[PDB]
Symmetry: D4
Subunit: 253 residues, 8 copies
């Protein structure tokens, strides 16, 4: 038990658990929306994926701040708030948590997925089920506009997160920040979601895609949409950095 | 009035009242969803059954902690937080409250039930009404996968309820814990509900089934779904124990 | 301005304004649900009529407690919390506020009502519009069962209101009671609403009916449903008294 | 950086950013409702446009109070709370923020707008898209009744926003005012929205209309509905002034 | 084989076979309309029950004229066209054919009926299946108005049958009368069908009702609708007699 | 019985009966389409109103030719085929038959009309029932365009009826002309019907309107649609005359 | 060209062409019903099959009688009407015609099939397309009941075909038999079709199944439904023989 | 009037009138299907466009045979049945008739077209109206497959027309050929219509396209779908020639 005494292990485990819980809730809501129409709705996805973040923040608040997203960690490290030493640990914890959450969601809804798909797993089609785990580019939307959407959404998320938590300007009452963050995520999903699925998280996107690829959806997951997989990994970092810079320069003294 | 002075009677009455109120709200929402399509929706069931737990916590907060679920009481007693002496009292109070709540819900919606069913009470069918009181296994889902779903959902519920209330790590602001618990139950219902009805409560499941059996739905309530009735009584205990152990070992110092 | 200095006038004006605001919001939500199907839903009615109570409590909190319901005032006066001297003043304020709110709602949605009804105002029918202002008994539901439903709902409301506000047992955090009361009203509407429209308020029911009768819907508003109008005036008083007695005897020490 | 030290520049930038964020969220929700029916609903618009005001208040709370609406600023200046010197600065900041938010929303949803409209931009019609940015008068509703609706809604908004914030009577708990304000806006949209789109904000209305006019929707945006554009600029000022006067005279000592 | 040489036996067998075929087609169309909505429509029932008469006329044209209806036989016998000696033979043949056709239709659609009803056979209800074999009075329609409808429809049918076949006035081209009669029945069903199911045939109505009663639908088939069963047995006789009298007196020289 | 010997009385009775039967079938189909959506469709109206003409032609073929339409009689008289002496007799017979058919249709569907309308008879509205008997101008269509539509449709009907019956060019096989005429009316209704209801018959239009006016629909039947009632009385005469002239000049030698 | 002079070659070619045309029309109607919901309906399939049989009868009437079905040929040969020498020639012609018709239908609707199925050909599933060519047993219906349905339908078809064509009893007018046969097939499809797809033709069933098997739907076409493929090959022969025997013994002298 | 005596003028006028009537009926049915969904269906289009051909055949039967299609005329002239001298006259008559029919249909449905399109005429889009007059290639279907479909459909039409009319083999009863031809066209539309709109007529396709181009739909009518306009002008000629050759060689002695 001597390993668990170190603070690095604690900051790894807290991130792992919080990301796992949030991803489980989000993927469950998405599966409900996709598979069964009677029990699913877009507002259900928004509520689940917004108030799962709240539970993750509650779980891993003091230990590591509950980043739960690699773009937020990159933005914090670039601004000097968090040293670069802890970046790989947070990234590994988030990736492992998301991968295990995707595995759990696949395990729970196995029979429903088989019944809906008819036994054949298709990435794209009328009965496609690969969109539950990772986001895919719609038909009308293009690649670079998707890049713009991802970067812009991540920028707004980072600016709002800076505004809510900042103690100098107008912080939320302590102990109620999780509800405000959850409502922020909910309204982000409601208002700016249909264009690209509002990924704005490399941890939410890549590990589920890898899990589907090794589970059996095939190599079409990467090559679909003119190699769309790398956009959610690149755009959010720049978006979050720009949003933090804008907030700090303008409103943050 | 000398009987009411004893603390055991108080801890019995508080549990009885809180469980009664929560079960009344939940069963009313379920009946609204089942009977009338215009006035019912899945989100309505989630909201009612999540924010009735908030009222129950408010009613029976200080006296006994408002366990309102036999799985939570078993998990607390196994970890030494609550002595084993008070377990039967809590179980009896919860069972009586749930039974009376089911009776009240049956009394209120009698004419609507008769009109919808046409006068014949059927456990399974196009106009089945036995699913209002207790959960039943869907067609595609099997028994052991239902056991897994129940155990996993109860484990997640226990882990989240332990994280929210824990004073050392990151407790919610006192006086606002009921809202957070209600939102947790709402998102659990939204995200992980369609597989088995998210029973995760022996008190919510068994007494309504017994009430239907003695009211006249017949003995088909127990034998349906390869004797499904015992799964919600066994799985949540193990799920809650495992969730509490995991949280205590990893995150709770 | 010497009249406004007296406390009686202030406690009358506060009740008038709070009841007016709450009734305006509730009737607007009901009109949205009834007239236009695209912009209306049952959940919209529940949210509007639940969180209008919150705004009324905020407006008239300290001056008079924001009873906004004759049943609550009668229950408080019968238990000795409020002297009988202030009962007529509160009743008159609530009645005037509700009547003016009904008049305002009629004034705002005049063209939409005329377009939907085709120019003819009918109490009952496929294009009936008299149900916006007052509740009417459904076809399957009978008179005495409606009396039972009204009394039971008012009793549950009074018990929950006692539980939430009581300082000794487990009060909500001060400054956040309005949100909890609004959520309570929302879940009451969601869970126990389709049977009779969850009137549980003489002030919400009678003055709008009188306004419709003098506006031109005819005398059919009173005689419809075997003289249903007197049930919402009688049942809630007994329901609230019984709920308060039960809470005080069992849980409130 | 010497310019940013002055308080006037700070009060300009805070208003600009808060109005920009709120308008972005509101227009995104409206576009979701209009373009795609599966991902859009009226409740989504209400939630987005209500809880965007919460984030705006959080962003620009201490610096300038987050007026975010010219009617509120005019009402405050007329009552002497805010000097007339700061009115033009606030108005310019709000106008610029709203114009840039409309431009951003147009940039993000360009392909979806082209696909839905078929390539032709029409102010009025079965595939009209000019209603995303600015509100337009419905067919049954007339001009002066729209004026009445706008003034009345702004009056109720001002009275409630004067109640939730007043420290003497019954203020909300500090740090939680943003949630209550957001819920107020949500219920306003739910209850009193279908008549005219509940503009009640010159900044929310005029700059998007100007942006559409210069973007290419034509000059039909102004002349439509018997020159409806000037009503949202005139009615809210009188409505807010009357609401503030009523609250101050009656309930505010 | 000496029995089959007699003309009475031949005129009995022809009626039996023709009535059997027509009833089989009609009941099959009705079952398609009732059970499966995708494969059923009112126009399908009209076409089947109209062009089954054509096939029956083709089968039993020369031997006995293909009366296939006790009302037509009674009308012909009362006018002296057919002697009273052959009335019981025709009635017995029609009754036996209709009973066997109902038995065959019950045998073919057994599994579909069990699946649709859930295993319980109900005369009236949301999943009622007793209406496939015999007609039942709707909720809004009364007994004596049903008598009037039946008599009037039978009178119109008899007048049109007299007009089509009459050689003196304007007979249809020989060999094509069956198509015209089928189209007449189709348009009768289309134009005057929703009030009472356009029974206008004792042979089409009573034997299926008796078959359901002995098969297990219970004694509710006779007592339903204020003893509706005797109206289709009495009204068509008077209707057909009056129609024939009117045609002969006015148009038929 | 000496009166019935005269040929004038015979032709009068034949026209009366044929028009009565055709109008009964057409109005029954229209009532089915209007009142009940499950049992009604536009194709049902077309088939009923097309193959009722066939039955009328069969009934009154040799005696008078079964004009059943004042426009056809006027066109025949203007061309010298029929002397002007018999025009008033035919017109009176058609008018009386149509009036009695409207009365019969009103008598049969009385309860259904009362249930659908809620007890109030409205010429125009969401539950209007005056359109069953007579045609009314739609909202988008204007008066003179309706005149053009009526005249053009009557012209095409006259040209086709002249071509079908003409013995010199290419007559249909005798005894099958009724089916061809019915199919012609059906396709006219299918192809050119939604603009004005394809009245093209003064006898089909005016007497039902008069019957509704005296039955209680009020004087709004005449004044509706800028006095639309006179167009179906004037346009078909000119249309039929022009069609007959065109056919005779160009194709009929 | 000396080969074409022989009567055997002519009786082969006529059967080939008629079966080809009828199968093409039927499969086109089925594909329209299955693929596109807007352009497809069950009544369309019924009309296509019936009036394609009509066209086949017109094409191959005098040369060979247009059997177009192996059951009819077997029934005729067993009764001595057709010698056994011509049975193999007719069977081969029908099989070749049906196979080529299936190939043509596959060639025409290739892109639509690929678009609907998403590129994957599945025998059973939500996007199954193997049912266009051959009939498959529904879920509720069993094997032996399907055998009974097929035999009974073929018996009724044979009895009606004997009745229509028989010159002694009541033949249809020569030159109009094709319309009557088409209407018979249409009403058979309307009344007795949903149970098993009313195959009642080995030539209509087996060759399309073989074509799908060699085209790429796999070997699941034969093994599906407990080896359902042999029922349409065996049942119709017995059904047709029994129907012919019954008609000849009872009605056919 | 000396011009009308010549047989060439008669063969021009008969073709003109018959084509005009058939095109009017077909375009009216198509407009009903496209504009109003309540009054339009695919089966309506099939019935109208099939039984308009019947009326055209009746009108112009003896004078010129009622070719009404340039493909049929070319096929007849190539086989020597009709001399090449009369080909240009028939083509000109058909073209003029179709152009005037398109003009008439545009004149009748002007207000409905403007209301549906919103005032803007678009060839392709959600509110496109250019498809009423001429057929356009669907999205999934390609150019050469459309050529194949057109040629194949015209071939089947020509083969069936040869079979129906041929006196030696099995002609339809004289005077009833029009009904059989109409049913043939109806089933062609039902079975093989959704791929390309079953143009199979240059006269039905090109003149309406030219009329739309000069009326104001723009030059996009020709360039749409990779210059689709020339396929309906080329494919039907080859299809009809091949069908006639096949019928003459194989079945026609």
């Amino acid at each position: 038990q001597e390993i668990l005494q170190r603070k690095m292990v604690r900051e790894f485990l807290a991130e792992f658990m919080s990301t796992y819980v949030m991803m489980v809730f989000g993927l469950g809501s998405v599966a409900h929306m996709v598979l069964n129409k009677k029990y699913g709705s877009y507002l259900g996805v928004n509520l689940g994926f917004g108030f799962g973040v709240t539970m993750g923040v509650h779980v891993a608040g003091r230990i590591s701040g509950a980043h739960m997203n690699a773009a937020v960690t990159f933005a914090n490290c670039a601004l000097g708030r968090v040293p670069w030493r802890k970046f790989p640990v947070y990234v590994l914890g988030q990736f492992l948590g998301s991968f295990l959450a995707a595995a759990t969601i696949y395990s729970l809804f196995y029979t429903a997925i088989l019944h809906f798909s008819g036994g054949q797993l298709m990435v794209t089609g009328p009965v496609a089920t690969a969109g539950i785990f990772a986001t895919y580019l719609p038909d009308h939307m293009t690649l670079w506009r998707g890049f713009l959407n991802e970067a812009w959404l991540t920028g707004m998320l980072q600016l709002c997160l800076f505004a809510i938590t900042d103690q100098e300007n107008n912080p939320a009452l302590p102990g109620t920040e999780a509800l405000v963050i959850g409502i922020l995520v909910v309204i982000i999903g409601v208002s700016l979601g249909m264009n690209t699925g509002y990924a704005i998280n490399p941890s939410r996107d890549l590990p589920p895609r890898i899990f589907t690829f090794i589970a059996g959806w095939g190599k079409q997951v990467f090559s679909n949409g003119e190699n769309w997989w790398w956009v959610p990994v690149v755009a959010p970092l720049l978006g979050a950095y720009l949003g933090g810079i804008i907030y700090l320069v303008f409103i943050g003294s």
